[PDB]
Amino acid sequence: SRGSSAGFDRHITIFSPEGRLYQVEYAFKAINQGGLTSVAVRGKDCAVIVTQKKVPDKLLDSSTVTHLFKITENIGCVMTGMTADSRSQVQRARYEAANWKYKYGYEIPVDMLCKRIADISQVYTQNAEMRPLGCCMILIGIDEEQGPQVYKCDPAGYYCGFKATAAGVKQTESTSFLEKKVKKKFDWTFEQTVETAITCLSTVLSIDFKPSEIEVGVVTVENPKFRILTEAEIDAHLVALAE
Amino acid sequence: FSPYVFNGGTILAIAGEDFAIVASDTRLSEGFSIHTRDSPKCYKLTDKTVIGCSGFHGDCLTLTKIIEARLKMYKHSNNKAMTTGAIAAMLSTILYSRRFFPYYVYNIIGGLDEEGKGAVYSFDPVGSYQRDSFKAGGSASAMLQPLLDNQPLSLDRAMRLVKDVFISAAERDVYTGDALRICIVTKEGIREETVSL
Amino acid sequence: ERGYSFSLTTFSPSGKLVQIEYALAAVAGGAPSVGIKAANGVVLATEKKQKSILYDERSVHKVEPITKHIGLVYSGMGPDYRVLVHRARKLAQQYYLVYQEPIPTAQLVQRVASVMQEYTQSGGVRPFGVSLLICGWNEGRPYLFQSDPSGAYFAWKATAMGKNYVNGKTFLEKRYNEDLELEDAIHTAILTLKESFEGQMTEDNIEVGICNEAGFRRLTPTEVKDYLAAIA
Amino acid sequence: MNARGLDSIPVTELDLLRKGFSCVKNELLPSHPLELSEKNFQLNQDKMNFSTLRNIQGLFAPLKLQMEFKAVQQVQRLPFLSSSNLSLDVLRGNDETIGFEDILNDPSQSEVMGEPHLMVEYKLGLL
Amino acid sequence: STGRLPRVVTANRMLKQMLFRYQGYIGAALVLGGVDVTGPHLYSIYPHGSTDKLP
Amino acid sequence: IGTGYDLSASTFSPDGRVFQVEYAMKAVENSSTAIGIRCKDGVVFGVEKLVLSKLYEEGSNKRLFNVDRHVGMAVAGLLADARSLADIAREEASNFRSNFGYNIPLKHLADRVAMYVHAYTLYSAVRPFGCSFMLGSYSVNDGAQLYMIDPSGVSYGYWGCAIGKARQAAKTEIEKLQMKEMTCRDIVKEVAKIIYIVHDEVKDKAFELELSWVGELTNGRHEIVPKDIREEAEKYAKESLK
Amino acid sequence: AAVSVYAPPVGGFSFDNCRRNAVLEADFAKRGYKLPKVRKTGTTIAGVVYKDGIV
Amino acid sequence: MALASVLERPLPVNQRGFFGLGGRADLLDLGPGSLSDGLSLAAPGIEMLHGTTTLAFKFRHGVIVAADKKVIEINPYLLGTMAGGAADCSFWERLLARQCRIYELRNKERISVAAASKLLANMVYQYKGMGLSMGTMICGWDKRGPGLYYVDSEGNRISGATFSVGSGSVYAYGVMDRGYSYDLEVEQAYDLARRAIYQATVNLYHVREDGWIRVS
Amino acid sequence: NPMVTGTSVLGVKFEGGVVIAADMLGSYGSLARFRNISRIMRVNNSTMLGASGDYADFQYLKQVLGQMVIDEELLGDGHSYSPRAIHSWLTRAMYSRRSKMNPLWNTMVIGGYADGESFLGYVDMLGVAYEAPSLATGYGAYLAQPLLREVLEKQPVLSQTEARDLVERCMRVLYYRDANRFQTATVTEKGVEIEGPL
Amino acid sequence: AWGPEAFTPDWESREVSTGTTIMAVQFDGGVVLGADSRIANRVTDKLTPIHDRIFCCRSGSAADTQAVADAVTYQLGFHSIELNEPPLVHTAASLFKEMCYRYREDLMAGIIIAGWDPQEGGQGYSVPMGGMMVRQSFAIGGSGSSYIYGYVDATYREGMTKEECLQFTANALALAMERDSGGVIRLAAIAESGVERQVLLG
Amino acid sequence: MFRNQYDNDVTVWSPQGRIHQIEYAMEAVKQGSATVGLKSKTHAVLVALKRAQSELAAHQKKILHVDNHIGISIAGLTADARLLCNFMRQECLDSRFVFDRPLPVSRLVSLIGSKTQIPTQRYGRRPYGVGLLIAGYDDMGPHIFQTCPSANYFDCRAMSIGARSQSARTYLERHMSEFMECNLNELVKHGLRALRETLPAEQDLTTKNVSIGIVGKDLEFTIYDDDDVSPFLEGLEERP
């Protein structure tokens, strides 16, 4: 440690006169640096994750550019923000899930994983040597007694369970659209969940999508393993939506 | 699991007015079997000192390597080569460093001193040492010391004596080698020759 | 002067610590919470920050139990609340293992406050930005405590904290009685929470928990709705 | 597998009231088969986690864990008082389990304690 | 912490790891049984830390 | 503008940026240009190596390392950091081979080294690395592969890459190649030609071309180009300059 | 404060009376005395898994 | 390697050549070291003095010690005797001589007999039961007059006017007990020591104000 | 705790290099069911190694030595390990492991051909090392050393075919002592060639 | 003496063994792993699944082998998630060998590993006490390892059908178990399509 | 004007991507005296120029001894030179003890660079302010290496470091094509003539301000001081 900067704004362990930490808020602002948006919707018997896919160069290999990861055999993920921080947090989550399984003899639940990640992330807020990671994590999975589950955690260390959440630049508009849809009706099948998840992003960004511009991952009760849809299936869903 | 193994050998040292003689056999054995018939036990340290050790072979090798490393360290630090007495004191300290798990090695150091006369030192596996005029070690030391005691001399008569002592001892010992090596330390340097047995 | 407002381990020339005052200011800017001790029970009420339809009711709660007879509510930061709740549960279990009887409320409050005091004396950390309200029932006698970010605890009869708590305190002073019952206390708690509320209160945006000789129980949304309809 | 773990007689050539009642021969060997195993449980567990994590993921993970431990274990009370070890327990994963080190021989109520300055000097490495 | 009733396998694993940690010097042979969401289960633990599942 | 928030690696700008990492990435553009092109059956590297004085040997301070039996590496930026990262990569490959008994896949090695690089942009006790590098490999069951890692810790797969002072012109020149349907023997000449075109002689007195490939010709091994092929490629590039 | 303490103490089991007891038991057996013993339980136990539960 | 240097605790995991639970880590450091001094931990023929007899007593004019070398000249003003293991006696008395020289250099004043005997006893007491075997009589003269102490490897440290250890201890001790006298001249003391050592079955030392001398 | 002997390893020196023969048998104790396993290692272009004793330690040393060779050849500075360097490293490793009472139960034979001169060494678990024109360790160590010693004493200089025939006849005598398969390796100017099983 | 003759610790005879018998036999499409029963038990499963297509059988001390199996399952699952591919049998065998060799002076553990992977097909490895790692066409361990080795070696042939391999393994296990016991023999056939377990009684 | 904030530590990057403390440390090499090192097909030669505090003090020594086949020359600070020399000696000693072979110069210099890179990245440290010239002999023949405070090393055929070494470098570059054929004589003379270009035109080289170190095919590293230098100085010309 080389000391702590002086000011109500330049360090993590210094309270403002009004009683608020500003480095945490700046870490929150750091999420919008990527420029992408993510939407997660929970159905009657399924959970769906949809996100953008931007490939600017032509010499890039599009196979190696992705934002959907896999924690365990039955837990998915999607990250928004700084790429390196997202990957580091993914590795930490994998290690924590493996340790829980070894110690307790059965698979870790989604809420337990989210709580563990949030508890680890809170410690960086109360010490002068470490800094928060600029990313947010959304997990999906299926419980035994309960159905699908959607969870989200933020750099401040706060986590909650939702019915339909979003993150990124267009979070507010996505939240309003999802609120209207859920208030209207919630009983959805597998086809309806994917359709509404795609429609939210389409109508918020005002873009007619293409099969190679999005990536989708689903979890269903019949097949509880995380699965990433292919270009043909994405195109079929898009054609059905257009018709 | 015994970490000690006995290997045969026999060493000797005679101190003169302006010379020193160190001789040893050249056999490696494990009681019954014969490992090699060519393995001298005399090592040259500097231009004016020679060390001869016998016993467990691995301990002998480790001791020689440690001694050479320490000699190099001293030469680098003090900008001069260290003498025979300093080598003897350092070896005594090194040996006592392992009192509770000793080296199974018997050492004899011969060479010249500051005034230019012969010097011979004899040790024990723990580190006790003293200056002598002639000393015999190794397996056959018990049956060789009385002969020397009942029998300073010049270089030629001392060499004659050394040759007859080893030729008499080899025929009555089961660990003596098929060749004898003699190292001569004088003011012009060091020379050595091998005598068939 | 601003020369002493940055470091935690520095005394002002007037003999004051400023960062602890700023932590208290952080506490005083959260959601309101109310605790009232009746003649045969204690009631805790609070607001919740979700106030939306996308929230899942089974995910996260603000009123949490420590033991069969102890529960608590907070006002301030939530991440700092979770770690303290976990430590309190661990301490209660340790006490039960050693002494083979449930921990009294006073001992638990003392140990939690002792834990919180440690972070206000060393350079390189920051104080907890949260305040706690603990209720219990031992030897047929209710208890109500409050613990500050400084590590100092008081025993109360009726208190409020969070946004607009001076008006809540004077409201409670005006309409508190020493011979109340549990239902009257619940009605008073709902009224004093409604005093600082801005929107339309429903059963989906407040939390209520009670503690009597039976144990510590968190009221279901149906019971909260029934109580709300009672006072209109 | 976390509980299974895998020539230091200096001569002063590099106070007897402070140290006493100790001989090299008795401390040459342990008194019980479980003594060293119990004294060094946490160290062995950390070593096992570091080994598996380094073999599976890489060098970065154990280094980051050690850096976090060192950073968080520098804001404690002075050694003559008892600390709480909250954040270290959170990072280490021992915030929801109770072992035999917690209910037996409470370190916060020990029957012996030395002088303050002596302990602070000993921790710094001066003595 | 988890908000729901525990499982038999969790208790079995904790007991096994404890008994193996203390190298069989803690003599305690146990018969463990219970029912959870998966169904009824029954185990058999030994002082040296070896479990065994039987009907 | 980030004045006041750019003295440590653990400080966030008011718009959510870390400026020390940005300065470290800016530092890479102070060195010469290195390119790498992936083709149908191999990967070939090329580095424009400046000459400081005539008193140095032929093989002094090279910029192409042998990480393993099947992996090459090309660097740009501060040299000492490049040596340190090469040592780290060698250690990782050796550890994997010792643990599991076969050659480490390229993606795993890239992930390991990228995470190690990223770990330095989190604490105030160290500073971020100041160098970028590329990795290349080939195998019968996987095919050619190419990756890049930058000081922030982000890795990606590429069909053709360029790092250094003049990456923009090099990328423009590369984007006009149908590298998917050619062979290493036909890519060495193109690499040499691009390097010669990009080089500026006004501000740089002289340079020496450095080349190496890995692929089916070398039977899955990273090797230096033979001298005659280097001479032929240089002659072709010089002729094409006219 | 004690003048012979350098480091803070810890918790857990204590192995202070190991060698003393080791020689004391041998001496008492040699001279033929009795020392307190450890209580033990040896009553039979059983269990079975029926249709939807454990007995 | 800068992140690993910050953590001031070198673990085997952070080093090179690590794989599995072990690896090529214990086979890396095989050098001969740089500088230190320390006895090795516990796991042939050892020279021991068996047929040796010694004698020592003090009187008005100094201390006379005789024996049958077997007497260690620690200092110009300090004398010692060996009995048992020769190597142990030589090593520990060399350490004692070094300590005495350090004391004299620091304090500009010679050490006393009592302090030297206490230092030797403290050094040899740490290894009780390990296997050391030595018995020493320490002679000297300081500001309090002549001194005489007996130190062994069992922790014993006693002071007296007459000591004897060896094979013929009983006979010589009886002779010099019969012939002892505090107010004794130097010549009669020499005669008594010679007669006692003769009846025990020849060296002879004499400590004075300003250092010991050799008589024969 | 009980001890059993090891398989036999033979070695002779001829004009152009060295010849080493080893037994394919697993072990003489309860591990006799692990048949048809090789015990001859090729270290580099001018060094080969034969082992006799415990197999797990042999595999561990094989791993370490192969990694060291790969590490040295990666640099490509023109320097390689000579047979004497391998001999010294093995001796030091054995002695260091022995000093901690956790030895490596092995008895190695090293042969090589560098700078036009052959090499033949011997290392055991206690750190005893030497060089001899012929070596023989294992079950018939005392029944084969004098034979090879006298044969080489009669003719100090031997050819490749003569050395191979002598090794074959010694192995035949050893099998005739107690009643199958073996393999032979040779180091010369060409390199290390291994032929087997026979 | 012990120097030139290269004496060996002889791990397999440290204590007398009176346990069950375990065998693994390779056929064309995969591998067949079986174990017999030979006090109480008779309703116990002696086959421990490590992954979806990898199994193992244990010999020696129960607690030590169970702990080793638990740790190996941990490490293999973590590695498979990290590399994003189905695991290889060689990796599991190496993971067993590391701990079976490092703790040879503390635990009495003997492991046999059988499984299937898309790269090399059905494989069977032996890791007896001491840390040896050898791949074999057929592997025998336990108590009848000396009684049935000659018969198995003489009768065994090259890759056969799954049913013939199951019959051969059952015959060998029955002859091993009726040495002079129990009546329950458990078998498992591992192939690409999946494991196929069955129990033979009476 | 704008540099005052970013040039106080080695853990801070300037807005132009530069570490100013490394560049400041590289300037300590020019505070010493000139040193010249060259090589031929068989031998390697080091020549150094010594300074003295006053007429009643001995000249400071510049050429040190590392092993029987390696020697170094110093230009810069002194404590750093001593520490590096100790490290070199220890590494050579350990390698010889373990493998019974001399340690290759390339491996030694790689170890030096790896050790020196560390203090330029972590807090609470400063870079080594010393530059070295290394001359050795192994299976690949003679070698001349140069080390920099920035943890950079080069493989040279003739190099000069110190104060006002540009003239020596110019002379070496001009006469580079004749070095590989000269024997020990005329090679020491080329080195001395190169070193003489760093002096004012009025004064010359005496026997009390020059040191020579030679290592060869069958000649170990030796240092010639004071009267031992006269044979090499006999044949020099009158500074043309």
Author numbering:
A (entry chain G): 2 to 244
B (entry chain O): 30 to 180, 193 to 238
C (entry chain A): 3 to 234
D (entry chain H): 1 to 6, 12 to 19, 29 to 141
E (entry chain K): 112 to 166
F (entry chain F): 4 to 245
G (entry chain K): 2 to 56
H (entry chain N): 1 to 43, 52 to 76, 91 to 223, 233 to 247
The authors write:
Dedicated assembly factors orchestrate the stepwise production of many molecular machines, including the 28-subunit proteasome core particle (CP) that mediates protein degradation. The CP is composed of four stacked α-rings and β-rings, each containing seven distinct α or β subunits. Unlike conventional proteases, the proteasome harbors three different types of active site (β1 or caspase-like, β2 or trypsin-like and β5 or chymotrypsin-like), each present twice. Previous work identified five CP chaperones: proteasome maturation protein (POMP, also called hUmp1)29–34 and proteasome assembly chaperones 1–4 (PAC1–PAC4).
Structure 5 shows the assembly factors within a completed β-ring just before half-CP fusion. Additional elements in the β5 propeptide and POMP form a belt supporting the β5–β1 subunits. Broader regions of the β5 propeptide are newly visible in structure 5 compared to structure 4, suggesting that its folding is coordinated with the progressive addition of β subunits. After emerging from mature β5, the β5 propeptide winds back and forth between the β-ring and α-ring to secure β6, β7 and β1 and then crosses POMP before terminating with the interactions already observed in structure 4. The β5 propeptide’s interactions at β6’s interface with the α subunits clarify observations that the β5 propeptide is essential for the incorporation of β6, while β5 does not require its own propeptide for incorporation. Meanwhile, newly visible N-terminal regions of POMP in structure 5 support the β6–β5 and β1–β2 pairs of subunits (right). A portion of the β1 propeptide (residues 16–34), visualized in structure 5, resembles a staple extending from β1 to β7. However, in the half-CP (structure 5), these elements are exposed, and either the majority are not visible and presumably dynamic (β2, β3, β5 and β1) or the β-hairpin is splayed outward or inward relative to the subunit center (β4 and β7). Structure 2, when compared to structures 1 and 3, shows progressive steps by which individual subunits are added. Structure 5, the half-CP, reveals the function of the β5 propeptide in completing β-ring assembly and its collaboration with POMP in this process; structure 5 also shows how the proteasome active sites are restrained before half-CP fusion. Comparing the half-CP in structure 5 and the preholo, premature and mature 20S CP structures reveals conformational changes accompanying half-CP fusion and eventual loss of propeptides, POMP and PAC1/PAC2 during 20S proteasome maturation.
